[PDB]
User: What shape does this take?
Amino acid sequence: IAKIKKFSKTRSKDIFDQLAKSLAPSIHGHDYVKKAILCLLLGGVERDLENGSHIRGDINILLIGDPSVAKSQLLRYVLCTAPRAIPTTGRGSSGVGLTAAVTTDQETGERRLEAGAMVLADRGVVCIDEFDKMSDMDRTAIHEVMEQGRVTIAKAGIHARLNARCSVLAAANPVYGRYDQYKTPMENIGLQDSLLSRFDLLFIMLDQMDPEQDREISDHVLRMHRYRAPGEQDGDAMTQIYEKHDNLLHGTKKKKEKMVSAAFMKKYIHVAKIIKPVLTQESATYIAEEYSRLRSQDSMSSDTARTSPVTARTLETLIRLATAHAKARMSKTVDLQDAEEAVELVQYAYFKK
Amino acid sequence: PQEEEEFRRLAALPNVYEVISKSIAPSIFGGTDMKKAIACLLFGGSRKRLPDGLTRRGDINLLMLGDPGTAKSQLLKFVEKCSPIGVYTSGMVLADGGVVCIDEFDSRCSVLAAANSVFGRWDETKGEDNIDFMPTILSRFDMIFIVKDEHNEERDVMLAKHVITLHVSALTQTQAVEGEIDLAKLKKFIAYCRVKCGPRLSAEAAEKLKNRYIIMRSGARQHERDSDRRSSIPITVRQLEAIVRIAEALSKMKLQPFATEADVEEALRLFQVSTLDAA
Assistant: This one.
């Protein structure tokens, strides 16, 4: 408790930068993806009104890119770190697996409800690899969960409603196998407008073979490969806030900075998720003006194209990302930079040249 | 127990590689590089686990492209016969650590695939667009070989003479040409080598392969940029892993605990001759 408070007070604005930086040392680059994963771990705020209407507080992110850009590694890492993480591949689980079903018990003759994949994963993370291979029917089934976080089931003799408030990670490959630079993102993604709109963030990853980028990636992979766990004999077959520095894991250049330990990061994430932020009036007008600029950017798009349509859900996405960023640092109110970070994320994700 | 001494004596020779290569389909004329690749595929690499729980493939996958009549099905049948575990398909669970041969390409299993040209016969002038498989599925294969009907009058005469000699002397005698190993003995030797031990690379060989991989990636970049066209056979870290596996298999063939630079050089030469010529 004391260590968490000391780290929060000393590192005031550096919490969100450091947690994203120290999210996955084994994976190089993709700072925006790490920030989005951190926002998912922090989560939004679920609001219930007097009339009983429910507003979703979860975020949906879809990752599309070329093969071998360390996407499955991120999914596996999130599965390991998340408390309630369930992996469901594209064709591994159908609508029956994802959505709870009704089975008639022969012993008593009554009908009982058996929970589906999403029903069990309440307030958790669901990772879906090869989402492009998934059929449209499963997408429509997942649409209800992504919209209202609930599943309605009605079979003669019984009817009930189950909660499905969950966040989803999806990784998919382009229709052509490799992302086409010349062709528009709409053709490469090959998904319906409703599915993209229900998704909150879209990330496109490119395997740019720059000499420096290739050299850095190769050096990082080679350093990780040559690393061996201490205390183990060579050739044998088989909590501090800052992690102990290693000559191979970190490097001589990275001696100036240290990475956060996994256990302390998990405890801080849990404490932050407990925290309930409150939106301020100053940020509301700024967010509204930026949303109006985003909607009016159609005449200012220049030669850049849009990956996803901008709808009313984007404003809710902006508010939810601001709430997650406010959860990143222990506070009570929403500041200007809190919304600016979300706006920068939206600018990076939505527009591509 | 005596077969242990026999295998140790056989593997201690300086010419085990050549004997094994000659033992792979002595009936088929030519294809020495293909026979060596088939042999090292049969020996295979070694799988390694990690503390994080991730696993890396210890099996090699190969792809063959060529005109009909290049004796591909015969090679697949010979591989299926020689391997301790072998499955032959026309295009996985029952095979564990064995070799699966797939014809008409258009779970710890090694994959050996054969396929035909898109137009039926290879077109040299057109270059690319002769392969229908997407780059994503092509990247899984460690090496890709291209065979063309090299029409030489003297080569046709030699091929006919070899076929007729096999036909005539086949019923008369069934003996090894020059120290060829019997099928059962080779099978048992391969099984013993796979069961006994698996080698690992060294630091100097690692650095050499690192430099060669960087140079090859830069050259592939330059070729793609100059050609102004996307190559159907990209080069990634999986190619480096495949070369590492081939070098380990070459070291495994000699039962040495540590791989040498010669194995890495031979693996690099084979990878060049296959992929770079294919690409």
